Each structure stands twice: as C-alpha cells, then as structure tokens.
C-alpha cells in the first residue's frame with residue numbers, strides 16, 4: 001500500500017495473508033474470509049502454483065513477524081479459479097480457496113459481507129484498500145498491515161485512464177486523479193472494503209494497475225457484485 005498508515009489489530013478481521021512454501025515460505029497475496037471454510041482472492045496469485053499443498057492461509061495477523069514455524073495456519077483443500085480467467089488485465093480475476101479446516105470466528109478473524117445484487121446501484125463513499133504490499137515501486141513486503149482510503153471512480157473515467165485496455169463492468173477502479181494512495185506489489189488478492197449503513201462490504205479484489213499510486217492511473221479491482229452468483233455457485237454446491 002502506497003500512502004497508507006499502519007492498521008490497528010482487529011481492524012480488518014477478514015484480511016488474510018496467503019503464503020507459499022515453494023521454494024521457501026513467503027507472503028504471496030492478500031485474501032478475504034467470506035465463509036468459515038472460504039477465502040476469496042485473485043486468480044493471478046496462482047500463476048505456476050501446481051498444487052494447493054504449498055499454500056498456507058494465516059488469519060488474525062497484524063504483523064508478518066507473528067508468523068513462525070509454530071504459528072497455526074489453515075491448509076488449502078482446493079483452489080477454484082474462475083474458468084473464464086486468462087489474465088488480470090482481461091478480467092475474471094477471482095478465485096476461491098476451500099480451507100481444510102473451519103475458521104473459528106472471533107474478534108481477530110471473521111467474514112466480510114459480500115455486496116447485495118440490489119446494492120449494485122449504491123454509491124460507496126468510504127472505501128479502504130489493505131495489505132502487506134510495497135509502499136513504493138521498488139520496496140519490500142511490509143511487516144504491519146497497511147490501510148489507505150481511496151475514492152471509487154466510474155468505469156467511464158477509469159477507461160479514459162487506461163487507453164489500449166478494455167475496462168469492463170466486471171472491473172471497478174479506485175484512485176485519486178493526482179495519485180499518492182493505492183495498492184502496490186503484494187497487495188493483490190486482498191480486499192477493497194467499503195462501509196455502507198454501518199456494514200462493511202467486499203466491493204473489490206485488488207487485481208492490477210499501471211505502476212503504483214501514479215497520477216491518472218487508478219488501481220483496477222475485480223468488481224465483486226458481478227460475481228456473487230459465481231461465488232454462491234461454488235460455495236453452496238449441493
């Protein structure tokens with residue numbers, strides 16, 4: 001996160017750090033708890049990931065230094081990538097991780113509500129992007145979870161900023177015209193959380209952008225409302 005500040009412990013209790021064990025253990029992507037055995041994240045996180053066996057989901061983490069070999073984590077039973085996904089820039093950048101065990105909800109770890117289909121018309125004015133990603137183009141993964149408040153931008157405005165790309169209605173953009181605050185490397189897969197009627201909703205999944213916090217280059221996110229039926233298809237399968 002560029003231009004953000006340290007989060008307080010328990011502030012984003014749906015935020016997870018997805019680690020890979022191959023070749024060595026390191027933070028791979030962000031993710032969000034959406035159900036007791038479900039993590040919603042970005043499909044691009046799994047490029048070259050051959051098996052869910054190398055993955056570890058850590059919930060209730062503020063600092064990456066809390067993670068040692070004796071730290072508990074959730075194993076991943078299954079990686080579900082949207083079957084229309086080709087690359088982040090073309091959309092369908094959404095994946096579900098089915099966990100091997102059940103997340104016990106509490107003050108440090110709980111789910112974020114998905115957006116309502118009826119709420120596709122609501123104007124979100126209090127949106128935050130969170131993650132352990134870089135604070136500048138060439139940096140390193142941060143120890144403390146960062147947060148930044150970012151305004152949502154219309155798709156017409158986002159399309160003007162991305163000449164040569166196709167910004168679809170299954171994408172949502174967020175950023176300041178002058179830049180300064182944005183997601184950066186290592187934040188991908190994490191949430192874009194918006195507060196509406198005292199309830200936080202998972203509005204976006206951090207996906208892609210041209211650089212980090214550049215003027216007239218907003219962060220591009222998977223527009224979660226457009227995938228509610230796909231999430232329910234996968235999580236409520238009989």
Ligand SMILES: COC(=O)Nc1ccc(-c2ccnc([C@H](Cc3ccccc3)NC(=O)[C@H]3CC[C@H](CN)CC3)c2)cc1
Nearest residue numbers: 026027028045183184185186187188207208209211212219
């Ligand atoms: C010690 O562990 C350690 O260093 N981990 C670690 C370090 C660096 C990265 C990283 C590097 C470069 N790109 C990314 C991802 C894409 C990806 C995801 C997973 C694997 C490979 C690529 N893309 C982004 O985050 C975007 C989001 C939207 C933004 C909008 N302005 C622009 C940047 C991550 C990940 C983990």
